[PDB]
């Protein structure tokens, strides 16, 4: 056993590292992927603040998925106080949610493609480069994300940190013109995401037929079971979410418990294996001490006493019994989620009444009861829990998808050549600012 460390990780959101024990062949025996993002402490600073402010603060946990936290936080407040929002407010929230999932999955295409090969060649995608096919692909992705952000801005008030959601529904309904504009854009987007999806699935399928990849000049073998783990999955909806107001909620808070990294991470180790050629800048210096239990910045939520995988694959496994697992299965399931986003937007626009009410007539102030809301963020189940009393948050808790995925991905690192541990990581589409909040 030797210990190699990659710090920082790259082509994901935010700040983490991989602390890896490897065998004499460089295959991970036990690896820890951990947040080293400072804890801004949103759960504790929320206490005493107003139920209107806390969702707008929680939004600023993450600018890729602010819709997830805005909606999950707002709907946790609504669940605690017992506020039923109007239909047209819900329809606008779903449109906002679906649009953001498009932009997020497409942004993630940008981050993972450099690890992938132009099918049938030994050339990797370089999306910066003004050459084909990369530039044509970048142009499609860029238009996809532009459409997505535009719809999000129209239905949510703002693409990043949406302003329209409020306790009890929305500040604004949209105009007949705005509704036509969103429909026009969704029609254009649906064709584009079908193209991007088929493109990505082909690239992934080419990856599954490869035997090695090139990292830092060297050939790295591709295990058949790359990224396999035995944690199973958790998901609350295929699209939107669930909350404790529902007749039959699809998440069970009696099965959840959160520990410190303590229960699940390695203690102190010393780095004795270093590779200065790891692109670009090498790995952690020999002699460095690391302690994942103490350095990890997240809590570890569990379901039935164990870490779980959340995210697109978790959703398709839970709701369609999708039956492939590991790194390339995760990539596949994410791409498959493209069309539902556009069909959902178009169906929601069809049902939206632009003269309809968007704010509940009565917003109660709460008595301290616990409520919770789950939003199926692009990366998986985002669960916010709250006690609101007299309009103030007395208790707040956030179980964010990448928080769930950190210990699970770690276990999935077993069997990988340490030089492609980052590829295992990127199939989770990590958001480490999310994970840490």
């Amino acid at each position: 056993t030797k210990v190699v460390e990659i710090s920082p990780t790259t082509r994901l959101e935010g700040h983490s590292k991989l602390t890896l024990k490897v065998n004499d062949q460089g295959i991970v025996e036990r690896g820890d992927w951990l947040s080293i993002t400072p804890v801004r402490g949103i759960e504790k600073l929320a206490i005493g603040k107003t139920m209107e402010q806390v969702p707008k603060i929680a939004s600023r946990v993450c600018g890729i998925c602010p819709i997830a936290h805005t909606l999950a936080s707002t709907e946790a407040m609504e669940a605690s106080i017992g506020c039923e929002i109007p239909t047209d407010a819900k329809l606008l929230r779903i449109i906002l949610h679906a649009a953001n999932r498009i932009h997020s999955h497409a942004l993630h295409n940008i981050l993972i493609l450099p690890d992938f090969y132009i099918p049938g060649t030994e050339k990797k995608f370089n999306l910066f480069a003004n050459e084909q096919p990369a530039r044509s692909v970048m142009a499609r992705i860029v238009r996809i994300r532009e459409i997505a952000q535009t719809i999000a801005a129209i239905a949510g008030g703002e693409a990043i940190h949406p302003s329209n959601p409020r306790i009890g529904g929305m500040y604004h309904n949209v105009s007949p013109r705005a509704k036509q504009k969103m429909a026009d854009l969704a029609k254009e987007c649906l064709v584009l995401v079908h193209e991007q999806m088929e493109f990505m699935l082909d690239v992934i399928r080419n990856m599954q037929n490869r035997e090695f990849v090139e990292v830092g000049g060297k050939q790295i073998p591709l295990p058949k079971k790359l990224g396999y783990h035995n944690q199973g999955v958790m998901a609350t909806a295929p699209m939107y979410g669930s909350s404790s107001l529902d007749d039959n909620p699809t998440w069970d808070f009696t099965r959840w418990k959160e520990t410190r990294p303590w229960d699940w991470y390695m203690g102190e180790v010393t780095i004795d294996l270093e590779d200065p050629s790891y692109p670009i800048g090498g790995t952690t210096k020999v002699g460095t001490k690391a302690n994942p239990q103490m350095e990890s910045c997240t809590g570890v939520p569990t379901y039935d006493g164990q870490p779980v995988e959340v995210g697109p694959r978790a959703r398709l496994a839970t709701f369609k019994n999708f039956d492939e697992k590991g790194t390339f299965a995760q990539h596949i399931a994410r791409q498959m989620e493209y069309p539902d986003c556009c069909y959902t937007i178009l169906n929601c626009l069809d049902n939206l009444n632009t003269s309809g009410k968007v704010l509940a007539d009565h917003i109660p102030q709460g008595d301290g009861s616990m409520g919770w809301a789950a939003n199926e963020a692009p990366r998986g189940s985002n669960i916010h829990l709250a006690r609101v009393k007299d309009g103030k948050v007395r208790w707040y808790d956030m179980l964010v998808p990448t928080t769930w995925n950190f210990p699970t991905c770690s276990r999935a690192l077993t069997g990988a050549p340490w030089q492609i541990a980052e590829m295992v990581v990127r199939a989770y589409d990590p958001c480490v600012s999310c994970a840490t909040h």
């Binding site: 509704k179 036509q180 969704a186 254009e188």
Partner: protein
């Protein structure tokens, strides 16, 4: 009288458009079909008319008996799917109590009216109460599911956003309210045509009092045939009253030469289909309504 073998019987043919600017705002072409029915109503030539009103789904027409200028104007614009206009023809003379019924529609609907005037079969009071018919040119029509498939798939547009549709210059054109344009090659649309159109031997509504369409005239303008004595009386008086700009059709491009050619292709192709029906089977064929 001219007795053209492809353009039917007519007195004259001009290029025209309504001088009513409100009508023109949403008219498909020159606003002739709206302008004539509004004018006939104001003048007392009709007391009501059957028009292709707005229906229960976007871009689906619903026939309706219109009896005000406002209701007539609601029917502006071409709906390229079936509108069963003649279904209200008798009823217009019953509960609606009309004495002078107007009828708008395409060539086969003009045919239906004249058959009812001459062979009324459980169509009492209809022969004598038809007062004025205005016929649109028509190459072919579509079911609503066909129109949906063409607009939503081939043009990739939402029906709720479409402001106008137009078949011209070899394409199905879709214009949206927010200002975009999409086209579909007509070759892609052929599978979707209503099969009963393939036996139709009438392009410029030969049997109407006045016939009107787009081909032969510039955009914003209509090609108009004035055919019957009813048609000539109403047109003359409307022109004299300032209701239309006109140009003799021979001074207009593409004019009557292009029109006569498309009429000829339609009849020629459909007459062939009519003929293939006779030997459609082995030792038997399909019915020919014209036999």
């Amino acid at each position: 009288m001219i007795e053209d073998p492809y353009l039917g019987k007519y007195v004259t043919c001009v290029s025209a458009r309504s001088t009513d600017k409100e009508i023109l705002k949403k008219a498909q072409d020159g606003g002739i079909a709206t302008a004539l029915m509004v004018y006939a109503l104001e003048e007392g030539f009709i007391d009501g008319t059957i028009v292709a009103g707005e229906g229960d789904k976007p871009w689906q027409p619903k026939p309706v008996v219109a009896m005000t200028r406002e209701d007539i104007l609601k029917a502006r614009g071409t709906r390229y799917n079936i509108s069963p206009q003649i279904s209200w023809l008798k009823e217009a003379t019953r509960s609606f109590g009309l004495d002078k019924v107007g009828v708008t529609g395409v060539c086969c609907q003009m045919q239906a009216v004249r058959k009812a005037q001459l062979y009324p079969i459980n169509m009492r009071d209809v022969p004598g109460k038809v007062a004025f018919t205005v016929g649109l040119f028509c190459m072919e029509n579509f079911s609503y599911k066909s129109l949906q498939s063409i607009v939503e798939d081939h043009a990739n547009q939402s029906l709720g956003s479409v402001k106008k549709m137009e078949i011209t210059k070899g394409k199905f054109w879709v214009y949206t309210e927010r200002g975009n344009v999409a086209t579909v090659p007509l070759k892609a649309t052929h599978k979707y045509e209503q099969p009963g159109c393939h036996v139709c031997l009438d392009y410029v509504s030969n049997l109407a009092d006045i016939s009107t369409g787009s081909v032969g005239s510039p955009d914003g303008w209509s090609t108009v045939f004035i055919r019957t004595k009813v048609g000539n009386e109403i047109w003359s008086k409307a022109v004299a009253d300032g209701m239309f700009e006109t140009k003799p059709i021979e001074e207009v491009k593409p004019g009557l030469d292009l029109l006569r050619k498309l009429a000829k292709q339609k009849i020629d192709k459909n007459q062939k289909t009519v003929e293939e029906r006779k030997t459609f089977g082995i030792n038997k064929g399909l019915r020919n309504p014209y036999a």
